[PDB]
Write a protein that binds this ligand. Structure first.
Ligand SMILES: CCCCCCCCOc1cccc(COc2ccc(S(=O)(=O)N3CCOCC3)cc2C(=O)O)c1
Ligand SMILES: CCCCCCCCOc1cccc(COc2ccc(S(=O)(=O)N3CCOCC3)cc2C(=O)O)c1
Lengths: 347, 358
């Protein structure tokens, strides 16, 4: 029920900037721009990560305590915003949450979007200071945001570069630019490395740890939660990979993995199932901004019944996660994680 | 400078060691370490290192005292942390400003093995590495929290300064009555004569430069040395003056500087509010203001030449020499009123070596 406190946190941060030694008119331009940056990119999502903080906190309460908990929830949503803006610059996105990517806007462009990624990212730490500077968990909380972010950056790095010629640097080459798949990297082990780092830590481990830290939980439970977070991050990204091909942009709110030369679960599954001749077709057709090329890939995914293989992967993983959840021996958190698991795809 | 510079590898390796702890396949670990070693080396080294040196000197001279090797380790860590921050800012600035050369070599984002997509991700990595390093070295110090807060707050001011530098002439600031159009993705850029004044310039330049280049390094050194104290406000005022003095000289170099000497090649074609522009605008004739308006902020070399010829025509170079003398004196005047021999000594030496380093 933390949707109502958004304005407070936004305004707290905008107030900080408003204290700057700047002319009044300039300050007006600043608040106008940054009010839009926050609203445009922090709102519209399922808010799964934010809600997770609130639920964990509650199940591990006066209105002053909620203020801290909800601050941390919105801090994770602001992190999510920073990530999506950056991710859309990097992957040249078109749409995100059913509207134009921030960086594509003529009043914004790549140059502002880059600066804005940093602003959103830093605003998180200023908010945590404002609301949590006097909590004993303060240092641990900022360290958790920091470390999860580091993992995400490394995951994003691998996702971006896994098929590049440097993973198969020339500091004198600024002239000769071509995306190709590298068959050696088309396997589940590599994929899990990538997805766990890119997704699991900030989407699951972080929000859960925030709730627990603030609740006053060193304790061996933190390790168990790290392990469950990994299973969930993988479950989550594979489902994201599945929708990229077999979903409607109307539901996902975003437009392209194939033409973007991404290592995805459907590519890895197809690759392990298909004939040698189709391995050659994939190589020849993947990662090409060309209609005929992506259609070839689409057809292979249908040919090799990827829908069916996802349907049964989902079953096995959901059972493996439920089994890891039961071994936590904490009634409250177990409930939250089972609930999260149900609500994952819809919010 | 020698000691500080010899400590580089230690701090880089400590951060790389942290990434090497990640649960990744050995082969991936080796690609990671190779890429990131280069990111740090390429972008962290070859600067003047004024900001890092400033941490080291302030740390030492805040108070004549015995300082052991373990204490130095922590001061050199903070010194390299500000050099890493400078590395992050310059990779980002070169993306945003369409840089071509930085420190006499290709901008990181231009490398075909890197590109904008990696550079953006690399800005965030460099930036986050600072805090990991401060944790590795200072997490047990009482000033730990204050030190990360100072990095954070300086960075926030720098982002706002960069925002203004990039947008001061933009449609959204000029046409302040109209909201940002979130449905327009298909980019008409001109100066806004209303913004062409020293008042706006100082706002921009103090936020974009002064806080991270002077205030931050000094405050780091003093925090670490063990020092609410009302002196901070006086060092903040000195920093603002030093930041203005440093940025105006930078504006000078952008257009009158020798690229082989400065190591970089765009303010005019980027439509920036610069000191040379403000100075010409307040001295030139009416017809020349209309010429500035028509030619400024365009990529066409012939358009830039028009602006450059005006700066030659109005002897802007020489006006700079005059500003330099007056400002250096105003800064020395504020320094001598600080009443702290040790810090005054570092700042005076700083003032002397600003533009050449060392
Ligand atoms: C050069 C590349 C380096 C990049 C620099 C580091 C920053 C990139 O870090 C990365 C990495 C990968 C993806 C992303 C984002 O992709 C996502 C989109 C939607 C969702 S969602 O389902 O929650 N969805 C969206 C609305 O939220 C509610 C429902 C979740 C993610 C995710 O990140 O999990 C962000
Ligand atoms: C990481 C977060 C990204 C978002 C924050 C703003 C985006 C970056 O935009 C920003 C912002 C601030 C500064 C900058 C860079 O401007 C500078 C270039 C060189 C020098 S230098 O001659 O000393 N340099 C240092 C080493 O000596 C070699 C010469 C000084 C500055 C300065 O302006 O101080 C670019």
């Amino acid at each position: 029920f933390f949707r109502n406190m958004y304005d407070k946190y936004r305004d707290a941060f905008l107030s900080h900037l408003n204290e700057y030694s700047l002319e009044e008119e300039i300050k007006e331009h600043i608040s106008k721009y940054y009010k839009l940056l926050f609203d445009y990119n922090c709102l519209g999502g399922k808010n799964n990560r934010g809600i997770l903080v609130i639920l964990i906190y509650e199940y591990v309460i006066n209105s002053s305590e909620w203020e801290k908990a909800a601050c941390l929830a919105w801090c994770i949503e602001i992190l999510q915003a920073a990530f999506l803006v950056a991710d859309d610059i990097m992957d040249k996105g078109e749409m995100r949450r059913n509207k134009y990517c921030w960086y594509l806007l003529k009043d914004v462009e790549t140059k502002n979007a880059v600066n804005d990624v940093l602003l959103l990212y830093n605003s998180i730490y200023k908010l945590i200071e404002i609301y949590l500077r006097n909590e004993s968990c303060y240092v641990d909380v900022i360290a958790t945001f920091r470390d999860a972010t580091l993992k995400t950056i490394i995951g994003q790095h691998l996702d971006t570069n896994i098929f590049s010629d440097k993973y198969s640097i020339d500091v004198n080459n600024i002239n000769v630019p071509q995306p190709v798949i590298d068959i050696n990297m088309i396997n589940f082990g590599v994929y899990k490395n990538i997805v766990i780092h890119k997704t699991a830590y900030y989407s699951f481990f972080l929000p859960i740890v925030c709730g627990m830290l603030l609740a006053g939980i060193d304790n061996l439970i933190y390790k168990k939660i790290e392990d469950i977070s990994m299973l969930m991050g993988e479950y989550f990204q594979i489902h994201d990979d599945y929708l990229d091909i077999f979903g409607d942009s109307t539901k996902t709110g975003k437009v392209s993995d194939i033409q973007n030369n991404k290592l995805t679960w459907p590519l890895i599954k197809t690759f392990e199932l298909c004939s040698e001749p189709d391995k050659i077709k994939i190589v020849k057709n993947y990662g090409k901004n060309n209609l005929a090329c992506v259609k070839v890939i689409d057809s292979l995914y249908e040919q090799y019944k990827i829908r069916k293989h996802y349907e049964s992967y989902e079953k096995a993983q959901k059972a493996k996660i439920l089994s890891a959840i039961n071994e936590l021996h904490h009634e409250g958190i177990e409930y939250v994680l089972k609930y999260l698991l149900e609500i994952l795809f819809t919010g």
